[PDB]
Write a structure and sequence with these properties.
Elements lengths: L5 H18 L13 H21 L3 H6 L1 H24 L9 H23 L15 H11 L4 E3 H11 L5 H11 L6 E3 H11 L5 H10 L4 E4 L2 H8 L8 E6 L7 E6 L5 E4 L6 H10 L5 E2 L10
Parallel strand pairs: 3-4, 4-7
Antiparallel strand pairs: 1-2, 4-5, 5-6
Bound molecules: calcium ion and chloride ion (3 copies).
């Protein structure tokens, strides 16, 4: 909402920088696994600088400043930067307690920051705005976005909800809340064409996407949200004697992709990343084929409703 001129960006990097200072303290004993906030933030500044030089060398600092996605973006960075600053300040020594709510928030902000990097890289590839040129991966999902939002690259949660409701009935405010949590990756109360793309790749097919999303991310014991490759394997160890035990996760380095971990007949733990097939189909097929039987070790897979 505040123009994105250099004056306004640097106030944003100061705060970002501030977050790096707080986080680079080795006392934190930050676990070395993605998302690596200390890599993400600088990487984020590097891309913001790359952008500025594209619109300086082209003398279009004007447009950039008045681009709505970009204005929202850097305002978001400020918001989250200030939020983490506040987290260390109010959190005090909780920030050195791994199993602390405040440290969970830190992990959540790091996730958010990582998503914002993937998003900005996607709509400003090589430093140039391509938001209006972002081709969505799933055809039926692409049809929806362009029909209701044309070439817009970002749109408020309120309107994304109202428009989605026209094609996919959103039963109540509570379901909306939950759906927002899933799709609003960057946690800025807007839905970007990138976020939509990720969401629709994950919960395809479009035609029953809320049903799919409910089955997969709301009611499914197997759904681990974001976890590392190692956390999935470690969490499955205890079911080694139970072939067909499985969980699935999102990857923060490969947004829009799923990873399934399961226990083989000979007690081994493998991982698989679906490429051609959508997760929803992969799970159902695999349950019938005898590989995906016990989600997070539970006795039965969930019903489809
Ligand atoms: Ca968002
Ligand atoms: Cl298209
Ligand atoms: Cl826009
Ligand atoms: Cl689809």
């Amino acid at each position: 909402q505040a123009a994105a001129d250099r004056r306004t960006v640097e106030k944003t990097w100061k705060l970002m920088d501030k977050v790096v200072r707080l986080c680079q303290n080795p006392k934190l004993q930050l676990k070395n696994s993605p998302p690596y906030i200390l890599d993400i933030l600088p990487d984020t500044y590097q891309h913001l600088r790359l952008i500025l030089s594209k619109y300086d060398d082209n003398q279009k600092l004007a447009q950039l400043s008045e681009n709505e996605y970009f204005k929202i973006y850097i305002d978001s960075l400020m918001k989250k930067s200030k939020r983490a600053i506040r987290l260390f300040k109010e959190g005090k020594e909780r920030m050195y307690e791994e199993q602390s709510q405040d440290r969970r928030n830190l992990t959540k902000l790091s996730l958010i920051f990582s998503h914002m990097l993937a998003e900005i890289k996607a709509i400003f590839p090589n430093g140039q705005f391509q938001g209006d040129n972002f081709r969505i991966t799933k055809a039926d999902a692409a049809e929806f976005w362009r029909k209701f939002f044309g070439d817009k690259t970002i749109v408020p949660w309120k309107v994304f909800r109202q428009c989605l409701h026209e094609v996919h009935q959103i039963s109540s405010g509570l379901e909306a809340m939950a759906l927002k949590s899933t799709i609003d990756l960057t946690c800025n109360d807007y839905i970007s064409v990138f976020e939509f793309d990720i969401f629709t790749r994950l919960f395809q097919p479009w035609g029953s996407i809320l049903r799919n999303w409910n089955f997969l991310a709301v009611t499914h014991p197997g759904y681990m949200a974001f976890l590392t490759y190692d956390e999935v394997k470690a969490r499955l160890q205890k079911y080694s004697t139970k072939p067909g035990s499985y969980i699935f996760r999102l990857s923060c380095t490969r947004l829009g992709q799923w990873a399934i971990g399961y226990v083989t007949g000979d007690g081994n733990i493998l991982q698989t990343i679906p490429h051609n097939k959508p997760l929803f189909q992969a799970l159902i097929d695999g349950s019938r084929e005898g590989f995906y039987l016990y989600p997070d070790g539970r006795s039965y897979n969930p019903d489809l409703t």
